[PDB]
Design a protein around this ligand. Structure first.
Ligand code: MG
Ligand code: MG
Lengths: 138, 72, 72, 136, 138, 72, 72, 136
C-alpha cells in the first residue's frame, strides 16, 4: 500500500513484544518505517555506553529506517500545536519529543506508530493519522 | 558535484514543489535531502533476533523517569 | 523540464550509483524513477464525497448576503 | 497541456453539482487548479466554527490546491481594472475579491474558473482567459 | 516619536469630523500614516466614477500615504487569526478587510487607526497596538 | 538597474533581516519594496480642505451595506 | 558589508535621485541613511521589567523536575 | 565585534538577576543574542497557559532574539557528541536539549550563553566557545 510510518520511541522499544512483530520486521526491511533525528538521540541516551549505541545504529533494524530531520516549518508547527493544546487546557504536556515527532509526521505525510496516549491529544487538534502498536494480551 | 536531472514531468515537479513548500524548504534543498535519505538507508534483512537485540540495548526508552531526564 | 541540484556529496552519489546498477539503471534514470514514485505515493485522491462535504461546510459561499458581510 | 486554472468561490461550492466533476477532480489531484489566499479567507468566513475550517483546509480538495498569493503588481492591476469599470458605470458589479482573483490569474498565467458573470465583465476589459464551470 | 499608523477605511472617512483633524493632517504630511492596497480598492469602490477615484489617488491626503502591500505571511496570519477567533466563538466576522489590515499592521509594526470595534476583537487575540480616532462630542 | 549599497553596519543589516523574516520576504525583495514605497510617497502639504474633499468623494466607506457588497 | 539590489525600476531610481538631491545627498548616501533610520525606528527596547516578567512567566525553566517531564 | 551568542534556558531565566543585565539587554536589542526552536518549546512548556505563552513570544526579550533552527548536520553532530560523552560515562549528564543547543552554536558560529555545567562537559570534547552568565 502507499502507507508509511514514523516510529516513536514508545513503539520502538515494544516491537519485540507485539503479536505483529514479524509484520513490522518486514515493513522495516521494505523501507516503510522512518525514524527522526530526535528519536535517534533518545536511543543514544538510553544506551548504557557509546559502543552499544554505535552498534545499534550500524545494524538492523535502525540502519534500515530512513531518517527524517527537522525543518523550520516543522519546528514552528510543533510550537503552534503546543500553544493550541494549552488553549484547550493541556498543562505540562504533551512532551517536546512527542510534539516534534507528530509535527514531522504531519508535514511529511507519515502515520505516527506509537504506544503513547498523548498522540491522541495531539490528533484531537491536528486530525493526523496515528497507529497504536498491538500489545500481547495479558 | 552537481547533477542535472532532465525531463521531469510537470506533475512530478508539482508534487516536489508541494512537498518542499509544506516543509519550508526550497525545491533543491528538498531534493538534496531526499537523495541523501535514500542513499543512507541500508538494504538489509531485519529479523526477530535483531528486534530483541535492540530492545535489550534501549530498554530505558520504556522508563518514563529516564526519558523525562533526557528532556530537561 | 530540467532541474539542477548543486553540491551533492560524493558519498551520496557513490551510494546512489551502486543502488542504481543493482536495478539495471543509470544514476539519472534511477533518480527520475525515484522522484516519480515519490510523487505517486504523495498524490491525494479527490472523491465525490469530498466535494459534497466541502459544499455542505461552506454552503454560505453561495449566499451573496453572507459574502456581503465578509467584505465589510 | 500547459493550461492551469484559478478557482473562484462560485465554482468551488458548485463542483459537486457539475457533470464535469470527474475531470475537475483529476485536475485538482494533479495540482492544476490553484486557489488564492483571499478565497481561503472566504472559506473560513463561511465555516460554522474553527474545527470545521481546519478540517476543510487539511482535507481534499483544498489540501491539493496550490495557493497563489498577492503581489504589488497584482494589487495595483486590480485597482486599475476597477477604475476602468467605474468609467463605464460598472464597478459596483464585480466585488473586491472578484478583482483580486481576476488580476492574480491574469498576471500569474492562469484561467479563472467560475460561475459569476462579473468575470465576463472584467475579461471584456482585460482580454484574459476565463472558463465557466458546467453545473446542474 | 517613533509611532507610525496604518489607517483603516473607518477612520479615513471620519478624519474631517474629528477634533484631532489638524493633528492628523500634519502626521499624514510627515509620512507617518500608511494605507493598504486593500483599503485603496475600498476607496475606488466607494467613488461614484473612475475620474473621481483617479483624482483622489493623485492628490493629498492619499498621495502622501505610504502604501503597504500584502505578503504571503500576512495573508496566512489573517487566516490564522480568523480561525483562532472562530475557536473563541466569533461567527461571520470580523470582516476580511479588517483581518488583512490588522495582520499587515501587526507584522509591519504599525498602529491600526480606526473607528471599528472589531479591531478590539482581533487585539484580544494578537495584543497589537490600536488607536481609535476621536469623535466630535454630541 | 542594479544598485550596490556598500558598508551597511551589522546592526542595520540585522534589523533588515528581522523585518524581511517577519514578512516572509527575502532581504532583497524587502529592500526593493521599501525603496519603491519611499520613491512613490508624495511630499506634499495636507490641508483641512483636502480631508473634506476626500470625505465627499468616499462617503460610501461609511455605509455598512455598500461595504458588505464590496466584499461578496 | 555590501548588499546588491537587482532590478530596481528606472522610475523608482529617478525619484530617489531627486529626493536625495533636495537633501544635499548622493543616491547611495540617501539609501544608507534611510535604511539606518528604518532600523532605529524598528528597534525594540528591553527593560528590567521585561526580564522580570519573563522570569515570572517561565520560572519552571529553573525547575529540573518540570524540565524532566518536558523531555519525556 | 563579530561575537554573537546563543542563549540557553538556564541563562534566559537568570538574566533578571545578573549584574551584567544592562549589557545583555543592549546586546539583545541589537540582535546579537539568538535562541533555538527547541528552547522556545521549553518556554512554552513552562508557561501556565496559552495566553501567557503568546505574550512571552511577542514581547521583549524573546521578540528581539533571532531564531536558529536545526539542520541535518547539527542533529548528526549532537548525536556524535552524545556518543563521545557515553564513551566516558557522562552522557546522562547533558540533556538532549543541551546537546542540540551546543551543536547549533558550534556549527552556526555562536557562543553558548548558559548557567549549566553540562556545557563545560560538552566543550571539553568539542573545543567550542562557551560563556557563563554572571548572576546573583
Ligand atoms: Mg461577483
Ligand atoms: Mg543540563
Amino acid at each position: 500500500t502507499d502507507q508509511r510510518w514514523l516510529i516513536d520511541k514508545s513503539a520502538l522499544v515494544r516491537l519485540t513484544d507485539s503479536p505483529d512483530m514479524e509484520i513490522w520486521s518486514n515493513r522495516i526491511e521494505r523501507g516503510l518505517v522512518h525514524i527522526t533525528g530526535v528519536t535517534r538521540l533518545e536511543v543514544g541516551f538510553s544506551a548504557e555506553c557509546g559502543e552499544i549505541a554505535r552498534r545499534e545504529f550500524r545494524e538492523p533494524p535502525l540502519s534500515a529506517m530512513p531518517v527524517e530531520y527537522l525543518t523550520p516549518r516543522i519546528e514552528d508547527r510543533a510550537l503552534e500545536v503546543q500553544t493550541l493544546l494549552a488553549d484547550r487546557g493541556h498543562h505540562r504536556g504533551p512532551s517536546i519529543p512527542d510534539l516534534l515527532i507528530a509535527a514531522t509526521a504531519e508535514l511529511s505525510g507519515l502515520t505516527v506508530l506509537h504506544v503513547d496516549k498523548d498522540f491522541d491529544a495531539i490528533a484531537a487538534l491536528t486530525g493526523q493519522k496515528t497507529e497504536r502498536l498491538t500489545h500481547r494480551p495479558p | 558535484s552537481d547533477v542535472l536531472i532532465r525531463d521531469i514531468p510537470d506533475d512530478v515537479l508539482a508534487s516536489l514543489d508541494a512537498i518542499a513548500a509544506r516543509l519550508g524548504l526550497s525545491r533543491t534543498e528538498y531534493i538534496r535531502r531526499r537523495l541523501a535519505q535514500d542513499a543512507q538507508t541500508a538494504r538489509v534483512t531485519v529479523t526477530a533476533a535483531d528486534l530483541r537485540r535492540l530492545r535489550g540495548a534501549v530498554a530505558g526508552l520504556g522508563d518514563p523517569e529516564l526519558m523525562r531526564q533526557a528532556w530537561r
